Design a protein around this motif. Structure first.
Motif, short mmCIF file in Angstrom:
data_model
loop_
_atom_site.label_atom_id
_atom_site.label_comp_id
_atom_site.label_asym_id
_atom_site.label_seq_id
_atom_site.Cartn_x
_atom_site.Cartn_y
_atom_site.Cartn_z
N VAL A 1 -3.35 79.83 -86.33
CA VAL A 1 -4.46 80.62 -85.79
C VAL A 1 -4.67 81.90 -86.59
O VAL A 1 -5.81 82.31 -86.81
N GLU A 2 -3.59 82.50 -87.08
CA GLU A 2 -3.73 83.69 -87.91
C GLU A 2 -4.38 83.40 -89.25
O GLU A 2 -5.39 84.01 -89.60
N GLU B 1 -7.68 77.96 -81.47
CA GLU B 1 -6.50 77.14 -81.31
C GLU B 1 -6.79 75.68 -81.63
O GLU B 1 -5.98 75.01 -82.27
N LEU C 1 2.53 74.84 -90.29
CA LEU C 1 2.77 76.04 -89.49
C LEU C 1 2.72 75.72 -88.01
O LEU C 1 2.13 74.72 -87.61
N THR C 2 3.35 76.57 -87.20
CA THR C 2 3.20 76.50 -85.74
C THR C 2 1.78 76.90 -85.38
O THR C 2 1.14 77.67 -86.12
N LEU C 3 1.28 76.39 -84.25
CA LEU C 3 -0.09 76.69 -83.82
C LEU C 3 -0.40 78.18 -83.99
O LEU C 3 -1.40 78.54 -84.60
N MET C 4 0.49 79.01 -83.46
CA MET C 4 0.39 80.47 -83.52
C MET C 4 0.17 81.00 -84.94
O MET C 4 -0.72 81.82 -85.17
N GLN C 5 0.96 80.50 -85.88
CA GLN C 5 0.82 80.86 -87.28
C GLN C 5 -0.50 80.39 -87.88
O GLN C 5 -1.13 81.13 -88.65
#
Ligand SMILES: Oc1cccc(-c2nc(N3CCOCC3)c3oc4ncccc4c3n2)c1
Lengths: 1058, 317
Positions: free
Chosen positions: A848-849, A1045, A842-846
């Motif tokens: 983190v969720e 993060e 996943l992307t960092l953003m994904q």
């Protein structure tokens, strides 16, 4: 009763905190700082106030926060802003005043009292008087004091105290005598009225009780003339000894001021001013010295300083330096010294030797400062180099002894050496060049060596830095005759002891190709063999079995040399280490890995030349014939297969078939399956099958691995425990256990295939950091230390590891709690996978969720909760926490400097008895962990969620952070000793392998790592350009260690949710 | 499926890319997208085929052949591929990878190679193309917004507040406004100097909107240039007036009691043509159709097993 009172307070704090867990209110927040106060836990509670601020600007006025934060100097100018913006406001004055009475600003406090006396408020009239009484007491005016004392009620301990002082001035003795006892009982009944929930007023009652018995010595110093020495001695000892923050000591001296004028005390007030400067109250300290000088706050500014009291001036000088005016400081120093040497040479009429001597030592301090400051103002270049060397040599002359003087001079020469070296590598980037360099370096190398030598002898038991530095020059200068003689001189000169600190560094250089260098090492090593062998055998034994010839060779000479002297010990140690390596990886265990590897090269790589290299030594290993029952019982069930399996291998070597070679692998896969089966059946080893020689061992003269130190009665191996539990792991380490000749039992960990030498140097560094922490008063005050353990390498493969008692891995402690509370062990993990099956991509953003989601659906208690259930009482529980938090914070900061990666839940453990944290496995040092290809770490040290939870609520604000900068302060101070050690095993010849793993010359790489370390010790770790002061760096670090993060990226095994 | 006037596509961690029929909530076809989550869906201006930007690949299934499997894959690029954008005239495609590059893809040719590369320090989170087809806006994780001139190759950068990663950026059809959203939760608006054709094309800061407290995940202008939408980790899509820059309609999936621990992030959005409606992608496995004005949930497209991060929407004639 007293030990039973803190118990209830601890237990109430538990529930009080668990209530704050439920809902953070100012109600609880009030009843929290207070209860932590009673528990005389000052800093932990201070953290409560940090939170109070960060979430409620709500007992309001930023001057009320600055006042409760005891930041009087911050609260004063805040109250000035608050009073000049607003109006009169009766309360705003009382605060504005309290700030003054703590700062000891009697000038302004007295004025603020008189100049503002409308005070129609009668409570404003009641407090008022207590402050102005002391203000006047500070300013002489006894009339004002008496006036304001006449307003203080005789009911207050305060009212009854100030009567005792005014009496003692007017010499009314039995008045004062009775005033003391009344104020005593007024304070005795006053420490029972605010029963527990008071300020530092039970801590400041000791300020009053001190002052009262001192005031009873001031009495003693009035009529009877014969304690003028006795009273001054106790006054003096109970000062350098006593530790009460600035503000108390002002009052304390004010009592003594009734009796002795500062000009007779001098040493007393200088010592006091000394503390005001160190603690950071220069404006105050200045005023102390200005008085002592009897001359201006040098308002006459362009004027020379008065030499009237050589000692006082020097203090003023360095106060000026520490102050702003530091070019001005340097200037008054040059001249001060000039005046001082003339006050010596000419003004000394012989019958004045003491004054000449004390004069000469104060001078050496001056030259030191002169050089120090020149370096500070100009740095290190062709103009400063000889000048500061001139200053240092001059300081060396005037004190001769004194560690610092010689040290400073050595480092200067050694940094003179470095300056030209690093200028010449700078030249080489873009024959008479080398010759002038040769003469350049030779000119500075020899003093450097000499200095470091006279410095070491002046340190004794505290010279690690200097000692290593001697080695840098020794090792680093492929030896020119001049340097070698200087070294040989030192070797003869300095004690043997010294070198023990350093033995592994020395042994790392046995096989030194530099011929003049090698000789001295060997000869010195043998002398270290003469007195305390034991300290030598284990390491020498390792070295004497070493693939590299020149190594093992030269090692054997030293051992031979030791036999003409301590033979059986050499022989004992010989065999013990031999046997232990047999027990570490057993025949079949070596066969298993060997067979795995051979199947990768051939079936999965098409490499038979690599494969043959894998198997051939395993066959040669057994060609020697079985030596223990365990070796024979393998030989039967497997030997014939393998001996003929190699036969097919050696039919193919000559035939080049593939049917000859497949008959071999046919046989090889047979034994593999057999062994793989018997593998989870290794859960114990009996010595009588595995190594009978070790079972035989009785009352040896060999000392229990890593127990030996001089000072301490030698503890020998009196017997070996007959069974070694096999910790079932991928490397199945052994729980070897030994019997001491003192009676006690010693446990180890026999590790098969991990180069333990790194962890040795790490433990070495630790020892130093421990010393440093024991030596900083604050760190000593708070018991700050690194829980360390013995690391005894046995080869490149194996070694022994000290087994700390009462410790369980974080992971273990959780696995129990989780199974006991019916929670699926890896519940967070399973949550994540259910949500995002492709998590690792996943992307960092994904990420983190997914992460946050997992955290929000799990308890963060666990750790915190099991450490409450563990505790037999509640006070025990509390201390175990105080311990835990501090100890963890230590290795957060040290861990950072060492660049300590890989801190997963099976790599740190907790001492269940004290609560103090403990780190194991030091493979991934320096940024290595973060530099790797797959799954790089983004964390400086684990400050993971269930750790945080387990601290006090208001955790990172309280003890953790304070302890963080306290430790970090020490480290930056002692940045050089710490760098000595680190440099020493970055450039260690044998240990450079851990940096070429960036692939899955080094000279350039090694330099970086070391700079990186300096950066961290000089606040340049984050941005190149800024130079962050400690608490900022700390703040920045805690931030980085907490960023979701960062944590969601951590490889799943690291458990970024624990 | 590309034959229906309204294309609506939905992707996520459940290894499918699903197509829905706008006016009913009934799922038309579903395609297999295994081995990776889907980071971005965009339907080519040509209405021929849709793009699935994934992990180290860009797979592209067909809206016309109504059945098969990825027409084109684009490989040989490490780390995630975050944004996809096409250029009106068929054959151009753009991406911003975690590999810190903005890449130009020739659609009418072979090679897993790309016609161009623009490289920065720090991963590129979003890539969008100025209406004039001549400039590319590229926002990375350091917090810099790059304008790449597709003719002059003249890199020109601009950081707003950032030391903070900028998350998505968009620019209104009329080329009057550009907007960028960052991880603090802020939304920056600039006024566009229409240099163009012998270009200057400059940026004049207009406003900072405190759009959100949590991560702001995407921003998008309505075709109108009337409204600006902001998707966030606070489980909310906020629609703002371009005239006032005031909040007009808030859409949210926030439980109904504080003790719920959220469930669902508002990943992406796409306006309708008439700018009357807005579509919504959420981690609670549902897409949603809202009335922009009433903020009414007019449909709920439920079908994905695992989360949704991707929308694609189309309104062309
Ligand atoms: O320095 C290293 C390197 C590799 C492994 C270890 C290590 N240390 C351990 N502790 C040392 C400190 O006191 C308690 C025991 C330790 O305890 C263990 N218990 C089970 C398995 C492995 C270990 C293990 N491995 C230590």
């Amino acid at each position: 009763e007293r030990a039973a009172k803190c118990r209830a307070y601890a237990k109430a704090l538990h529930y009080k905190e668990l209530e704050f867990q439920k809902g953070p209110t100012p109600a609880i927040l009030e009843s929290l700082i207070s209860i932590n106060n009673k528990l005389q836990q000052p800093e932990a509670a201070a953290g409560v106030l940090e939170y109070a601020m960060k979430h409620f600007g709500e007992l309001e006025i930023q001057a009320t926060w600055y006042e409760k934060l005891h930041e009087w100097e911050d609260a004063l100018v805040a109250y000035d802003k608050k009073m000049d913006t607003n109006k009169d406001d009766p309360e705003l004055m009382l605060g504005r005043m309290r700030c003054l009475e703590a700062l000891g600003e009697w000038g302004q406090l007295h004025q603020q009292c008189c100049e503002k006396w409308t005070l129609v408020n009668d409570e404003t009239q009641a407090k008022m008087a207590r402050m102005a009484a002391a203000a006047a007491w500070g300013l002489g005016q006894w009339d004002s004091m008496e006036e304001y004392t006449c307003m203080i009620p005789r009911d207050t301990h305060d009212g009854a105290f100030y009567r005792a002082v005014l009496a003692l001035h007017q010499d009314l003795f039995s008045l004062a005598q009775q005033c003391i006892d009344k104020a005593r009982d007024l304070l005795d009944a006053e420490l029972t009225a605010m029963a527990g929930e008071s300020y530092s007023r039970a801590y400041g009652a000791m300020v009053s009780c001190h002052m009262l018995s001192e005031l009873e010595e001031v009495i003693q110093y009035k009529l009877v003339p014969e304690r003028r020495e006795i009273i001054r001695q106790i006054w003096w000892e109970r000062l350098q000894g006593c530790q009460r923050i600035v503000e108390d000591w002002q009052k304390i001296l004010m009592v003594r001021s009734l009796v002795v004028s500062p000009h007779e005390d001098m040493r007393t007030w200088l010592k006091y001013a000394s503390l005001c400067g160190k603690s950071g109250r220069l404006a105050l300290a200045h005023k102390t010295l200005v008085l002592l000088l009897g001359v201006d706050p040098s308002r006459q500014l362009d004027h020379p300083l008065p030499t009237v009291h050589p000692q006082v001036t020097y203090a003023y000088m360095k106060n000026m330096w520490k102050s702003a005016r530091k070019i001005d400081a340097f200037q008054h120093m040059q001249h001060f010294v000039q005046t001082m040497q003339q006050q010596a040479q000419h003004a000394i009429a012989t019958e004045d030797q003491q004054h000449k001597q004390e004069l000469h030592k104060l001078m050496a301090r001056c030259f030191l400062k002169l050089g120090e400051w020149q370096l500070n103002l100009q740095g290190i270049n062709e103009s400063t180099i000889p000048k500061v060397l001139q200053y240092y040599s001059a300081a060396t002359e005037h004190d001769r002894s004194w560690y610092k003087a010689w040290h400073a001079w050595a480092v200067m020469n050694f940094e003179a050496v470095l300056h030209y070296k690093h200028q010449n590598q700078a030249r080489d980037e873009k024959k008479k060049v080398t010759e002038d360099l040769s003469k350049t370096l030779l000119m500075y190398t020899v003093p450097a060596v000499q200095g470091f030598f006279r410095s070491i002898s002046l340190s004794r038991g505290n010279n690690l830095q200097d000692t290593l530095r001697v080695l840098t020059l020794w090792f680093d200068y492929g030896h020119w005759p001049d340097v070698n003689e200087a070294l040989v001189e030192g070797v003869k000169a300095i004690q043997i002891d010294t070198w023990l600190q350093v033995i592994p560094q020395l042994i790392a250089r046995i096989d030194t190709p530099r011929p003049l260098v090698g000789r001295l090492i060997h000869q010195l090593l043998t002398d270290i063999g003469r007195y305390h062998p034991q300290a030598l055998i284990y390491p020498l034994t390792v070295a004497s079995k070493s693939t590299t010839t020149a190594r093992h060779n030269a090692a054997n000479k030293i051992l031979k040399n030791m036999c003409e002297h301590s033979n059986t010990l050499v022989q004992q140690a010989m065999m013990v280490s031999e046997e232990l390596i047999r027990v570490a990886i057993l025949w079949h265990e070596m066969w298993h890995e060997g067979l795995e590897e051979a199947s990768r090269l051939y079936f999965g790589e098409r490499n038979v030349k690599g494969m043959f290299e894998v198997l051939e030594p395993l066959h040669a290993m057994m060609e020697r014939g079985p030596q223990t029952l365990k070796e024979t019982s393998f030989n039967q069930a497997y030997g014939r297969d393998l001996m003929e399996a190699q036969e097919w291998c050696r039919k193919y070597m000559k035939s080049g078939n593939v049917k000859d070679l497949t008959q071999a692998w046919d046989l090889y896969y047979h034994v593999f399956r057999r062994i793989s089966k018997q593998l989870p059946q290794l859960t114990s080893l009996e010595l009588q099958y595995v190594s009978p020689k070790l079972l035989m061992c009785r009352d040896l003269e060999l000392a229990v691995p890593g127990t030996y130190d001089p000072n301490q009665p030698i503890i020998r191996i009196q017997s070996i425990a007959p069974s070694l539990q096999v910790i079932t792991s991928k490397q199945r380490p052994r729980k070897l256990t030994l019997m001491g000749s003192n009676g006690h039992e010693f446990v180890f960990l026999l590790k098969g295939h991990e180069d333990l030498r790194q962890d040795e140097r790490v433990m070495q560094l630790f020892g130093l950091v421990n010393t440093l922490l024991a030596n900083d008063p604050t760190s000593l005050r708070k018991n700050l230390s690194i829980q360390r353990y013995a690391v005894i390498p046995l080869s490149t493969n194996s070694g022994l590891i000290g087994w700390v008692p009462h410790c369980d891995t974080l992971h273990a402690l959780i696995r129990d709690y989780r199974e006991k509370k019916k929670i699926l062990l890896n519940i967070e993990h399973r949550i994540m996978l259910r949500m995002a099956p492709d998590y690792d991509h996943l992307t960092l953003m994904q990420k983190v969720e997914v992460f946050e989601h997992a955290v929000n659906n799990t308890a963060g208690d666990d750790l915190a909760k099991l450490l409450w259930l563990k505790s037999p009482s509640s006070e025990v529980w509390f201390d175990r926490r105080t311990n835990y938090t501090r100890s963890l914070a230590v290795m957060s900061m040290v861990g950072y400097i060492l660049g300590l990666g890989d801190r997963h839940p099976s790599n740190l453990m907790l001492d269940r008895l004290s609560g103090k944290i403990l780190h194991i496995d030091f493979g991934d040092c320096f940024e290595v962990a973060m530099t790797r290809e797959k799954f790089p770490e983004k964390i400086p040290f684990r400050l993971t969620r269930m750790l945080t939870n387990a601290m006090e609520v208001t955790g990172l604000d309280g003890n953790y952070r304070i302890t963080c900068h306290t430790v970090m302060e020490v480290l930056r101070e002692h940045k050089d000793s710490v760098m000595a050690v680190l440099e020493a095993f970055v450039y260690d010849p044998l240990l450079n392998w851990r940096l070429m793993d960036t692939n899955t010359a080094l000279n350039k790489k090694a330099i970086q790592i070391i700079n990186r370390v300096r950066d961290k010790l000089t606040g340049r770790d984050f941005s190149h350009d800024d130079t962050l002061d400690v608490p900022t760096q700390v703040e920045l670090l805690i931030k980085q260690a907490t960023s979701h993060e960062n944590l969601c990226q951590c490889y799943i095994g690291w458990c970024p949710f624990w | 499926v590309g034959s229906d006037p309204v294309i609506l596509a939905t992707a996520g961690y459940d290894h499918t890319v699903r197509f829905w029929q706008a006016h009913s909530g009934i799922c038309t076809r579903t395609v297999q997208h295994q081995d990776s989550q889907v980071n971005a869906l965009e339907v080519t201006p040509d209405r021929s085929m849709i793009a699935a930007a994934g992990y180290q690949h860009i797979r592209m299934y067909d809206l016309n052949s109504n059945n098969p499997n990825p027409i084109i894959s684009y490989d040989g690029v490490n780390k995630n591929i975050a944004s996809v954008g096409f250029h009106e005239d068929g054959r151009w495609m753009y991406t911003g990878g975690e590999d810190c590059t903005a890449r130009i893809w020739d659609l009418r040719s072979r090679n897993l190679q790309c016609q161009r590369i623009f490289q920065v320090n720090a991963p590129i989170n979003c890539v969008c193309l100025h209406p004039n087809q001549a400039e590319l806006i590229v926002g990375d994780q350091s917090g810099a917004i790059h304008i790449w001139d597709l003719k002059t190759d003249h890199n020109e950068q601009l950081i707003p507040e950032p030391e903070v990663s900028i998350t998505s950026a968009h620019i209104d059809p009329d080329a009057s406004y550009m907007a960028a959203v960052n991880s603090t939760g802020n939304c920056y608006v600039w006024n566009l100097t229409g240099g163009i054709g012998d270009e200057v094309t400059q940026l004049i800061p207009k406003t900072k909107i405190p759009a959100h407290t949590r991560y702001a995940l995407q921003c998008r202008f309505s075709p109108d240039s009337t409204l600006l939408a902001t998707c966030s980790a606070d489980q909310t899509c906020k629609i703002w007036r371009t005239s006032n820059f005031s909040l007009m309609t808030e859409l949210s999936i926030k439980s109904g009691n504080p003790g719920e621990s959220s469930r669902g992030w508002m990943w992406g959005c796409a306006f309708s043509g008439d700018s009357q409606y807005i579509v919504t992608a959420s981690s609670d496995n549902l897409a949603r159709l809202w009335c922009v004005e009433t903020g009414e949930i007019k449909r709920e497209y439920g079908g994905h097993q695992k989360a949704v991060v991707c929308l694609a929407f189309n309104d062309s004639v």
